[PDB]
């Protein structure tokens, strides 16, 4: 079944936070091209 954090109410409150007080994206998820070159199809 669908988790509670994914349910409208407490989901809306969770979006507000990532909008108004946005976590540092490219810091936590740094290394952009990390998952190798074109050797991704095998």
């Amino acid at each position: 079944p669908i988790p509670a954090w994914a349910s409208g109410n407490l989901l809306t409150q969770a979006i507000r936070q990532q909008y108004y007080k946005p976590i540092d994206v490219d810091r936590m998820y740094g290394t952009i091209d990390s998952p190798k070159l074109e050797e991704l199809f095998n």
């Binding site: 954090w5 994914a6 979006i15 990532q18 909008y19 490219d26 936590m28 990390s34 998952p35 199809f41």
Partner: protein, 249 residues
């Protein structure tokens, strides 16, 4: 590097060409995003392998508040997982389906955010080529989001089989603007031949309800000769755009 175990799958958001998009939350930050799950099998069985390579390298470089963000990506045996910025207000095409058409200030806002993000892309030597509602998502306060990188939306040169530059996006922007206010694309026909003849002759027929302000912007954007189409700068500065845009920044 990431795996599917790093994320909490909450629920799906809708199918696509190559797989399902899920509402996800990476457990480390408890940070919400959208997981686009693609299947290697079909990706290969349709040769769309080349494009996927580019759409990733692009978002390794492109960062703009009006371009959908790809945080990262990974891949198990069977899939490629795209870590995409969550667009809370879903896609724009369905909003256009609901409302039938948008009012002047809604569209004018969309146009400034679009012209803006397009400019950013152009500076980095990146053309989009295909900008229609179906490729546009909406932020928490409704701000426009160019998501992924059709007859009605093809500029004359594209139809005629000539080489094209960045200016196809200027044409497309006009077509888009028109559909926003009217509800239908500007050169709609019941045959691909009639549409073809309408695009190249720029057979522009503006309905009675359209403001002269908007008509003008559209007319300047939808010009045959590419180098005449109003530059992105001229869009954001257009009287009707200035007078109607209400963007959150």
């Amino acid at each position: 590097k990431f795996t599917i175990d790093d994320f909490d799958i909450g629920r799906p958001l809708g199918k696509g060409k190559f797989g399902n998009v899920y509402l996800a939350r990476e457990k480390q930050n408890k940070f919400i995003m959208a997981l686009k799950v693609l299947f290697k099998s079909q990706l290969e069985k349709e040769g769309v392998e080349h494009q996927l390579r580019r759409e990733i390298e692009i978002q390794s470089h492109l960062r703009h508040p009006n371009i959908l963000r790809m945080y990262n990506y990974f891949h198990d045996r069977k899939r490629i997982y795209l870590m995409l910025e969550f667009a809370p207000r879903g896609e724009l095409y369905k909003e256009l389906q609901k409302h039938g058409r948008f009012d002047e200030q809604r569209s004018a806002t969309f146009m400034e955010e679009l012209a803006d993000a397009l400019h950013y892309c152009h500076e980095r030597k990146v053309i989009h080529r295909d900008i229609k509602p179906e490729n546009l998502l909406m932020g928490y306060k409704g701000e426009l989001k160019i998501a992924d990188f059709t007859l009605d939306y093809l500029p004359p040169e594209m139809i005629e089989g000539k080489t094209h530059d960045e200016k196809v996006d200027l044409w497309c922007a006009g077509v888009l603007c028109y559909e926003f206010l009217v509800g239908m694309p500007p050169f709609d026909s019941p045959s691909h031949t009639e549409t073809h003849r309408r695009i190249v002759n720029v057979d522009l027929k503006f309905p009675p309800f359209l403001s002269d302000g908007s008509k003008d912007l559209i007319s300047k954007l939808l010009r045959y000769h590419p180098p005449q189409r109003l530059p992105l700068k001229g869009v954001m500065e257009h009287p009707w755009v200035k007078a109607n845009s209400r963007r959150v920044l």
